[PDB]
Amino acid sequence: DDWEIPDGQITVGQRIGSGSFGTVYKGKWHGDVAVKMLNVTAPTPQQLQAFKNEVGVLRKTRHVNILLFMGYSTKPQLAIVTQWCEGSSLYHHLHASETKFEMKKLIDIARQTARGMDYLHAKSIIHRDLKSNNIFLHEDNTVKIGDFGLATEKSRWSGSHQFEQLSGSILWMAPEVIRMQDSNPYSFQSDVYAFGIVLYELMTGQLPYSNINNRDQIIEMVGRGSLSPDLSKVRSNCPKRMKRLMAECLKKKRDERPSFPRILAEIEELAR
Amino acid sequence: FDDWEIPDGQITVGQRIGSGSFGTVYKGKWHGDVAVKMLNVTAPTPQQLQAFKNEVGVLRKTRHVNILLFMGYSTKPQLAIVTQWCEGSSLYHHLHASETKFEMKKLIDIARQTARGMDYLHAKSIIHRDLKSNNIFLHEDNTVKIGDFGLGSILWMAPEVIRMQDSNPYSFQSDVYAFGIVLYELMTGQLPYSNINNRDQIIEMVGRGSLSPDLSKVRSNCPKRMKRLMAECLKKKRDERPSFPRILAEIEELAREA
Numbered sequence: 001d002d003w004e005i006p007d008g009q010i011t012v013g014q015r016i017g018s019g020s021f022g023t024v025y026k027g028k029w030h031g032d033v034a035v036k037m038l039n040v041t042a043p044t045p046q047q048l049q050a051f052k053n054e055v056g057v058l059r060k061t062r063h064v065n066i067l068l069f070m071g072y073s074t075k076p077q078l079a080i081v082t083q084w085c086e087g088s089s090l091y092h093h094l095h096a097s098e099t100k101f102e103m104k105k106l107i108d109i110a111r112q113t114a115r116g117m118d119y120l121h122a123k124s125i126i127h128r129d130l131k132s133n134n135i136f137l138h139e140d141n142t143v144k145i146g147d148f149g150l151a152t153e154k155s156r157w158s159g160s161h162q163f164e165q166l167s168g169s170i171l172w173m174a175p176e177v178i179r180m181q182d183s184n185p186y187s188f189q190s191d192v193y194a195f196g197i198v199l200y201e202l203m204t205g206q207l208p209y210s211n212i213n214n215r216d217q218i219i220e221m222v223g224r225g226s227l228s229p230d231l232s233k234v235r236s237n238c239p240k241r242m243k244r245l246m247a248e249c250l251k252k253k254r255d256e257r258p259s260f261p262r263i264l265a266e267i268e269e270l271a272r
Numbered sequence: 273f274d275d276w277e278i279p280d281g282q283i284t285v286g287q288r289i290g291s292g293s294f295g296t297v298y299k300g301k302w303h304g305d306v307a308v309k310m311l312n313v314t315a316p317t318p319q320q321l322q323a324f325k326n327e328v329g330v331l332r333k334t335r336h337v338n339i340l341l342f343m344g345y346s347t348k349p350q351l352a353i354v355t356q357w358c359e360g361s362s363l364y365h366h367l368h369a370s371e372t373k374f375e376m377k378k379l380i381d382i383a384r385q386t387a388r389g390m391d392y393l394h395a396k397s398i399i400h401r402d403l404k405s406n407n408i409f410l411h412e413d414n415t416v417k418i419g420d421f422g423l424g425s426i427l428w429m430a431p432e433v434i435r436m437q438d439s440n441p442y443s444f445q446s447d448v449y450a451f452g453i454v455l456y457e458l459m460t461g462q463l464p465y466s467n468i469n470n471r472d473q474i475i476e477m478v479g480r481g482s483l484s485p486d487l488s489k490v491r492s493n494c495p496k497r498m499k500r501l502m503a504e505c506l507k508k509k510r511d512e513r514p515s516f517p518r519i520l521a522e523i524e525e526l527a528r529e530a
């Protein structure tokens with residue numbers, strides 16, 4: 001309640017993108033800011049609590065490669081206020097842009113996002129949706145990890161709506177639906193895997209399985225355990241140490257991936 | 273699709289009937305009585321509108337006496353869906369707060385009408401996802417209206433996470449099971465697991481197959497043919513469960529005996 005921004009201080013600007021949740025707009029508040037709004041008309045007490053909890057998570061981050069939480073509102077609509085990034089997503093640079101990156105820059109980007117992720121796990125925060133689209137290249141040299149995935153727990157945003165809209169329905173739930181209620185596949189190791197995919201894009205310039213245009217076989221083959229990215233797609237000058245690190249983060253069996261403190265030492269060392 | 277929108281001002285919103293963080297339901301006037309379900313959305317984005325136009329699309333596919341009648345929708349003053357107004361109470365209210373004691377004859381009729389509507393939805397490839405006696409409105413105390421349906425990172429998903437994208441427990445058979453539960457409360461007049469009363473316990477025990485509705489409680493004058501139908505819908509293994517075409521044909525053949 002210390003970070004609540006009084007209303008009428010922010011001048012909301014141009015919409016930058018939307019979602020099933022709401023909208024992100026550029027804004028003016030002691031300078032440039034991004035504003036993530038939940039366009040809920042009349043949030044429920046439980047929706048408000050789940051919002052406080054997400055703000056609880058964000059306010060414990062303070063690191064240069066994590067998008068900076070600056071404040072939150074609840075007065076008109078639920079809102080989260082962050083620093084404003086200039087430039088584009090890492091996805092846009094790698095995949096939708098003419099200009100490509102030197103190897104030394106790619107490794108530096110890999111290093112910055114390992115620092116952020118190492119910082120998150122040190123603080124027991126799982127990102128849950130790490131992808132190159134969620135890595136903003138601020139001023140086109142500073143990684144800012146943002147757009148935290150939706151936590152499944154009954155104390156966070158999505159889990160509160162999942163647990164609220166099925167709270168009074170369990171008596172009618174087939175066993176197979178019950179079992180799927182409480183799930184959560186997300187871990188530190190799952191974060192590490194996504195990071196391996198982010199490395200795959202940096203070091204190849206492409207998205208994995210660009211050769212499998214079916215959401216359904218990817219799901220079956222990667223899930224089933226027989227399909228993993230094509231590492232012979234890494235560029236000529238990718239260091240073999242970077243390739244080895246990659247294969248380790250991408251191991252199919254979850255408890256076989258490395259932790260981020262080890263991941264980080266490795267990249268800073270090889271950047272040499 | 274543009275031909276089912278109701279322009280701003282035509283609907284007169286009355287008593288609030290029920291809230292929730294996704295929407296609120298009102299009684300309204302529009303060429304008579306209607307129910308207005310307001311979505312808790314202010315100025316919907318592109319993607320929320322396409323989600324909305326997509327779900328109205330499903331509701332636009334239903335025309336059946338036992339399916340709550342879709343009548344229209346609005347985008348201002350707010351996103352809303354408009355349906356017929358049902359007179360009376362839900363089935364849940366009747367069984368568990370009125371003790372109306374619908375003599376068996378009607379208990380079966382209600383189960384016939386509910387199976388009629390479910391067979392219709394399934395024949396349209398619509399899974400309800402939340403069938404229960406709260407969502408079965410007993411219009412004028414005679415007609416069943418089933419209402420209240422429920423509902424780009426795979427490249428970055430580890431095998432264990434990508435597996436969950438491949439599940440979805442909601443199927444024609446989980447609708448059948450929920451129908452089996454409604455049957456249980458018609459024929460016992462009681463909710464399952466009354467004795468237990470601990471959501472965590474029930475979640476854990478049903479999910480693993482140690483706990484099942486105590487069929488010892490179906491009343492004495494309950495036709496055991498549909499006591500056996502109840503038991504078939506409630507099979508823990510979802511593939512051991514019957515389809516609605518067969519559920520309906522069965523439940524309509526015992527109603528002849530009256």
Ligand SMILES: Nc1nccc(-c2sc([C@@H]3COCCN3)nc2-c2cccc(NS(=O)(=O)c3cc(F)ccc3F)c2F)n1
Nearest residue numbers: 017018024034036058067068069082083084085146147148
């Ligand atoms: N230029 C610029 N600058 C900054 C952000 C953005 C965009 S662009 C976009 C994408 C773009 O496509 C359509 C909308 N989605 N999202 C943000 C943004 C905005 C707010 C929050 C988050 N993520 S967060 O979990 O809420 C978070 C909150 C917090 F307090 C601290 C750390 C966090 F990680 C965001 F991803 N842009």
Ligand SMILES: Nc1nccc(-c2sc([C@@H]3COCCN3)nc2-c2cccc(NS(=O)(=O)c3cc(F)ccc3F)c2F)n1
Nearest residue numbers: 289290297307309331340341342355357358418419420421
């Ligand atoms: N008296 C009376 N009459 C009729 C309805 C209701 C109530 S009461 C209630 C619950 C009661 O408990 C607390 C308040 N909420 N809901 C409706 C209602 C209102 C609108 C839609 C739906 N379901 S639907 O998916 O959106 C749908 C939309 C559609 F177009 C066609 C078929 C559909 F199934 C509804 F369940 N009441």
